Amino acid sequence: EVKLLLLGAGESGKSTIVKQMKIIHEAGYSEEECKQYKAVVYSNTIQSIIAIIRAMGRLKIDFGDAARADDARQLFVLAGAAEEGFMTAELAGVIKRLWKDSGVQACFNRSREYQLNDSAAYYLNDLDRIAQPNYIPTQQDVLRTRVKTTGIVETHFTFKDLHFKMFDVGGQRSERKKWIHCFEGVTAIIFCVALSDYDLVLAEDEEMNRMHESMKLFDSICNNKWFTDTSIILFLNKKDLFEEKIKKSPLTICYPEYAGSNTYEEAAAYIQCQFEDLNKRKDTKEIYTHFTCATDTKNVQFVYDAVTDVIIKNNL
Numbered sequence: 350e351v352k353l354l355l356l357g358a359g360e361s362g363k364s365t366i367v368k369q370m371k372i373i374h375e376a377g378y379s380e381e382e383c384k385q386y387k388a389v390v391y392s393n394t395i396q397s398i399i400a401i402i403r404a405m406g407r408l409k410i411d412f413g414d415a416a417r418a419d420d421a422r423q424l425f426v427l428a429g430a431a432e433e434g435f436m437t438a439e440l441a442g443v444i445k446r447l448w449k450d451s452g453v454q455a456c457f458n459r460s461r462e463y464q465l466n467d468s469a470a471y472y473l474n475d476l477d478r479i480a481q482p483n484y485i486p487t488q489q490d491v492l493r494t495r496v497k498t499t500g501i502v503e504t505h506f507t508f509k510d511l512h513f514k515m516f517d518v519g520g521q522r523s524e525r526k527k528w529i530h531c532f533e534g535v536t537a538i539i540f541c542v543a544l545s546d547y548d549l550v551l552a553e554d555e556e557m558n559r560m561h562e563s564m565k566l567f568d569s570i571c572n573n574k575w576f577t578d579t580s581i582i583l584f585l586n587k588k589d590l591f592e593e594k595i596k597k598s599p600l601t602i603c604y605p606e607y608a609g610s611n612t613y614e615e616a617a618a619y620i621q622c623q624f625e626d627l628n629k630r631k632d633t634k635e636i637y638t639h640f641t642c643a644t645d646t647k648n649v650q651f652v653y654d655a656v657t658d659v660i661i662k663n664n665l
């Protein structure tokens with residue numbers, strides 16, 4: 350048996366790694382399982398367009414076309430259905446027209462100023478597909494869903510003849526007090542960091558930079574004497590979102606002394622060193638760092654293969 354524990358701040362990608370284990374090692378989500386996620390996809394979609402519409406009020410952004418005001422009204426009249434797992438053609442049309450509005454887009458592109466699901470664009474750009482009658486979520490749709498984890502999720506799978514018990518816990522501040530319930534008999538910790546968090550603030554506190562919060566947690570876990578003999582794996586996750594963001598959002602928002610360019614390789618490396626430097630015992634404790642896109646099954650497959658071999662060599 351191998352006990353793996355996923356840790357990291359909220360929305361760092363822990364629960365998405367869990368889903369990937371089912372897809373990679375257990376033949377994925379069945380049709381009945383996918384259908385269970387349909388209301389989650391619909392809920393994520395409605396909540397995302399609504400969050401942008403709410404932000405337009407706060408930031409004082411007009412619709413590009415005045416005709417959208419009536420669509421916005423109809424959005425709330427019709428939203429109830431999607432919350433129950435149904436999306437009518439009329440609702441889809443309302444959301445589609447809203448999503449294409451230049452005012453809504455302006456607000457979308459300022460999402461760091463409020464709280465918006467990372468998968469907002471993914472679902473909203475695929476409205477024609479997901480609004481289909483008899484729509485059944487794909488594996489990617491399932492991977493892209495967002496539900497805050499409360500309590501402790503335990504998943505089992507077999508890989509390279511090892512029986513893995515993977516534990517997943519909530520990362521938001523309210524759930525941190527529960528991490529200690531998972532601390533016994535841990536073979537390895539996979540600590541997830543959202544690379545794209547560098548310019549965001551906490552949903553639970555708008556004065557706290559998300560990445561600074563991540564750093565504090567990693568510092569605490571990595572250097573905890575309880576975990577001296579526990580393999581510490583660092584997933585610098587959301588590399589796909591990071592690659593896009595680094596082009597246009599300065600890393601100095603997070604790290605004032607960053608002197609490199611607005612490019613993926615230099616900035617990614619700099620963030621890696623910031624986290625690895627928190628290790629107070631560099632000669633006696635190794636950190637196994639990987640850059641990941643948790644929603645990308647192929648990337649996770651190869652990364653997780655490499656991680657597993659490390660775990661086999663070091664703990665078994």
Ligand SMILES: Nc1nc2c(ncn2[C@@H]2O[C@H](COP(=O)(O)OP(=O)(O)OP(O)(O)=S)[C@@H](O)[C@H]2O)c(=O)[nH]1
Binds near residue numbers: 361493494495588
């Ligand atoms: N584009 C992209 N999206 C990702 C990536 N990793 C996770 N996500 C998405 O981000 C959202 C949050 O991921 P999730 O797995 O729920 O984080 P969590 O760490 O479990 O969050 P919590 O339970 O502590 S609140 C999900 O919608 C998920 O699909 C990634 O690498 N790239």
Ligand SMILES: [Mg+2]
Binds near residue numbers: 496498517
């Ligand atoms: Mg989770």
